[PDB]
From a paper:
The most frequent PTM reaction catalyzed by [name] enzymes is the addition of AMP using ATP as a cofactor, coined AMPylation or adenylylation. [name] [name] belongs to class III [name] proteins, which are comprised of a single [name] domain and carry an autoinhibitory glutamate in their C-terminal α-helix. We discover that EfFIC has both AMPylation and [name] activities borne by the same active site. Furthermore, the conserved glutamate implements a [name]+-controlled metal switch that tunes the balance between these activities without conformational change.
Author numbering: 8 to 207
Write the structure that this text describes.
C-alpha cells in the first residue's frame, strides 16, 4: 500500500479518490489559465504539473523520488544519477517532432516521481508541441494498446511512438474539448476510468 494525505486504507478507494481529485485539479489547471503560465519543456514545469494534480493526495507531489522503481520491461533512471539525468533532459533540444519525441522518451525513462509520471508527462508533452510546432495531440486518435506498446518499445526505437504522435497532431491548440478528452484518455491509459473530467 502507498502513503497518502487522506488517511485512506483501501487501494481501490485510494484509486477512486485520486482520480476524482487530480482530475478536478487538471480541469482547474486549464480553466484558470495556469497551464499557460508554466515553464515549457523543463523538469521545473513537469514538477509544477505533477504537484498541481497530486498535492492534495500525496506528500511527494512535484518531488523527485528518493528510491528506485521497477515496472514494465525496461528500467527507469536509477536514483544514483536521476538528478543529473533531469539536468540533461532540460538541455535537450525541442525544435522539431524528432527532438520533441526524443526528449519525451528520455523523460519517460527518467520517471522522476513515485507515481503519476505518465499523466503529468503527457500534459508536459502537449505544451512543448503547442509552443514549438503549434500542435497538440488529439489523444482520441491514439489507441490505448498501440500507445502502451509504442512506449515500451521507445527506449530501443522511438519510431512507433513518433508515428502515433505525428498522426494524432491537430492545430486546434486552444480547443478545451481536445484537452478535457485527452485527460480522460491519459487516465484510461493508466486504468483510471471511474470519472469524466467534464462532469467534475
Amino acid at each position: 500500500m502507498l502513503e497518502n494525505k487522506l488517511g485512506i486504507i483501501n487501494q481501490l478507494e485510494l484509486n477512486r479518490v485520486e482520480e476524482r481529485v487530480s482530475k478536478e485539479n487538471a480541469k482547474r489547471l486549464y480553466d484558470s489559465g495556469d497551464i499557460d503560465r508554466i515553464e515549457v519543456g523543463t523538469f521545473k514545469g513537469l514538477s509544477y504539473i505533477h504537484n498541481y494534480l497530486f498535492e492534495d493526495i500525496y506528500e511527494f507531489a512535484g518531488k523527485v523520488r528518493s528510491q528506485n522503481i521497477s515496472k514494465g520491461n525496461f528500467r527507469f533512471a536509477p536514483v544514483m544519477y536521476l538528478e543529473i539525468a533531469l539536468e540533461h533532459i532540460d538541455k535537450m533540444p525541442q525544435r522539431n517532432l524528432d527532438e520533441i519525441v526524443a526528449k519525451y522518451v528520455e523523460m519517460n525513462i527518467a520517471h522522476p516521481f513515485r507515481e503519476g509520471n505518465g499523466r503529468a508527462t503527457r500534459i508536459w508533452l502537449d505544451l512543448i508541441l503547442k509552443k514549438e510546432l503549434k500542435r497538440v495531440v488529439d489523444w482520441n486518435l491514439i489507441n490505448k494498446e498501440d500507445y502502451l506498446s509504442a512506449m515500451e518499445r521507445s527506449p530501443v526505437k522511438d519510431l512507433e511512438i513518433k508515428y502515433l504522435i505525428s498522426n494524432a497532431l491537430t492545430d486546434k491548440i486552444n480547443d478545451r474539448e481536445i484537452f478535457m478528452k485527452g485527460i480522460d484518455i491519459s487516465y484510461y491509459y493508466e486504468g483510471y476510468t471511474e470519472y469524466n473530467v467534464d462532469e467534475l
